[PDB]
Design a protein around this ligand. Structure first.
Ligand SMILES: Nc1ncnc2c1ncn2[C@@H]1O[C@H](COP(=O)(O)OP(=O)(O)OP(=O)(O)O)[C@@H](O)[C@H]1O
Ligand SMILES: [Ca+2]
Ligand SMILES: [Ca+2]
Ligand SMILES: [Ca+2]
Ligand SMILES: [Ca+2]
Ligand SMILES: [Ca+2]
Ligand SMILES: [Ca+2]
Ligand SMILES: [Ca+2]
Lengths: 361, 196
């Protein structure tokens, strides 16, 4: 029988079958309940479309599962509605954020065995899956998703927790900022389809400037940086410096009023928290993963910023795999396919004997 | 040719009887004692890269972390690495990987109803059947590679707008171009009916 792979993110669930090269189910990690006036909950696209009558909640906050009642609804939807499988017939691989608390991993394990009756399970660290999928045991992962951005240094297969940095700024903040600056141009984005337009513009037209101030000057002096997005009805929205002001927020969090270092400085700070003897390997192996690393120009900008900060004789290299939008899921798909990993799966009988703490051993 | 070489092949480590040739489409794990080398072919796939890295950590851990792991990019071998072998050779060998493109049978397509009447708006899955196509609403047929948006003869302009935007977001979340076909009630092409 075939393993299932579920990469639960703050904004999106990515799920599918081990051995597939892409997740076949991708849907919003949102649970809607019609509170205070027999189906009692909605998930995903259906839920987000009915915001006017549902109370919507995100069960995963900054990568960490926080609302377990709603997370169970997400997993039930994943198994039965999206994948249309019987969970008791499939070993299931789940992913977890950096610095996930032990009690959190234990509750994930309890729910998989006691609620869904999976025959076996495994929990993998998201950043390690991405690093291995790039063919590396050592490097520093920049994982930027919808709710959180982490820098995760990894040495010969093991994450270095004291040097992990967390920045509570990622794709949802960029969507909200683009919506703000487009509303300042006199547009209105209130309906579900209008909010999808902002998301589509962000993912299709935005880019990271190599030099922000020079790019602003170019945008002020000519229309060569303008690009247009055509709506289904033939309307056209044209943007110029909004294209690169939006993701500039990753490097300048003050654009949205956040008093935090940008992603180049958090990367440098993370490397500086590691022992000097491994920093050379981290500088040469900055691996990007996650949907918010997909902006054209981001690798070249990171290369420039890190080079400005790094010591003499260090080699700076940013790795941006073309598949990095879903590199966590793809890493899990590979893992759950590999013969030599089968011995490391937790079986239901082991859970019955040992309880949830078996997930650490 | 002193180190032990494992050729990653279809999700397994295969110990090479006579190492030295390295194919650009593949990955290899080279156990040279105090040093473990990952040899990453420039045309290799993620499943091959992953097994090499994971296996190197396992072998190092087996020796309580006492080996240095080095990553080699195929075609750019250092002098240290080439001299380990009697006759180091770079070839075009490429073993096919284990990952497969997503494919849907017809019993797996999904059908989505799009409704928008004032502030009465929603998406909703409905049973994949020609019966579900109501002429006053819009419907999305998801066949993975192709998305058909069927616009009822009596559907509102807002529902047609919403259906196309939803189809755009499906395409955006799936790697590679998915074709979006806008279909009009009463002039459906044969390609559309096959999905039922
Ligand atoms: N091509 C693109 N350009 C810019 N942003 C993109 C692109 N594709 C997806 N995104 C953004 O990536 C985010 C989703 O990424 P991902 O699936 O990695 O996050 P997640 O796992 O749900 O969240 P997190 O990792 O923060 O818990 C969304 O904000 C989405 O708009
Ligand atoms: Ca994620
Ligand atoms: Ca020989
Ligand atoms: Ca190969
Ligand atoms: Ca070691
Ligand atoms: Ca209607
Ligand atoms: Ca098809
Ligand atoms: Ca696509």
């Amino acid at each position: 029988t075939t393993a299932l792979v579920c990469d639960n993110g703050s904004g999106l669930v990515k799920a599918g079958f081990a051995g597939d090269d892409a997740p076949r189910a991708v849907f919003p990690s949102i649970v809607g309940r019609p509170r205070h006036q027999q189906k009692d909950s909605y998930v995903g696209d259906e839920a987000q479309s009915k915001r006017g009558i549902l109370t919507l909640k995100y069960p995963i906050e900054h990568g960490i599962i926080t609302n377990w009642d709603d997370m169970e609804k997400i997993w039930h939807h994943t198994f039965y509605n999206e994948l249309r499988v019987a969970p008791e017939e499939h070993p299931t691989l789940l992913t977890e954020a950096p610095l996930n608390p032990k009690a959190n991993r234990e509750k994930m394990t309890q729910i998989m065995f006691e609620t869904f009756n999976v025959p076996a399970m495994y929990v993998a660290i998201q950043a390690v899956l991405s690093l291995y999928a790039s063919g590396r045991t050592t490097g520093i992962v920049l994982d930027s998703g919808d709710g959180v951005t982490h820098n995760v240094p990894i040495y010969e297969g093991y994450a270095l927790p004291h040097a992990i940095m967390r920045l509570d700024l990622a794709g949802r903040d960029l969507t909200d900022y683009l919506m703000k600056i487009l509303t300042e141009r006199g547009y209105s984005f209130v309906t579900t389809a209008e909010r999808e337009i902002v998301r589509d513009i962000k993912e299709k037209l935005c880019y990271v400037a190599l030099d922000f101030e020079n790019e602003m000057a170019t945008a002020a002096s000519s229309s060569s940086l303008e690009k247009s997005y055509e709506l289904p009805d033939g309307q056209v929205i044209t943007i110029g410096n909004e294209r690169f002001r939006c993701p500039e927020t990753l490097f300048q969090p003050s654009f949205i009023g956040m008093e935090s270092a940008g992603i180049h400085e958090t990367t440098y700070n993370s490397i500086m928290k590691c022992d000097i003897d491994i920093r050379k390997d981290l500088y040469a192996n900055n691996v990007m993963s996650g949907g918010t690393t997909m902006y054209p120009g981001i690798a070249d900008r990171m290369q420039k910023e890190i080079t400005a900060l790094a010591p003499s004789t260090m080699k700076i290299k940013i790795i941006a795999p073309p598949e990095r939008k879903y590199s966590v899921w793809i890493g899990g798909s590979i893992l759950a396919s590999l013969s030599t990993f089968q011995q490391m799966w937790i079986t239901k009988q082991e859970y019955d004997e040992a309880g949830p703490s078996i997930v650490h051993r | 040719t002193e180190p032990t070489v494992f050729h990653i092949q279809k999700g397994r480590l295969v110990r090479m009887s006579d190492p030295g040739a390295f194919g650009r489409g593949d990955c290899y794990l080279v156990d040279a004692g105090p040093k473990i080398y990952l040899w990453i072919g420039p045309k290799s796939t993620a499943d091959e890269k992953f097994l090499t890295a994971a296996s190197a950590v396992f072998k190092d851990t087996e020796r309580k972390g006492h080996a240095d792991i080095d990553r080699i990019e195929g075609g750019k071998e250092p002098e240290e690495f080439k001299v380990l072998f009697d006759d180091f050779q770079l070839t075009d060998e490429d073993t096919e990987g284990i990952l497969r493109r997503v494919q849907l049978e017809k019993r797996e397509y999904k059908l989505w109803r799009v409704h928008h009447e004032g502030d009465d708006t929603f998406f909703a899955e409905v049973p994949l059947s020609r019966s579900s196509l109501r002429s006053d609403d819009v419907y999305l047929v998801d066949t993975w590679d192709d998305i058909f948006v069927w616009r009822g003869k009596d559907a509102s302009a807002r529902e047609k707008f919403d259906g196309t935007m939803l189809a755009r977001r499906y395409d955006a979340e799936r790697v590679g171009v998915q074709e979006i076909e806008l279909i009009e009630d009463g002039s459906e092409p044969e390609e559309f009916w096959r999905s039922f």
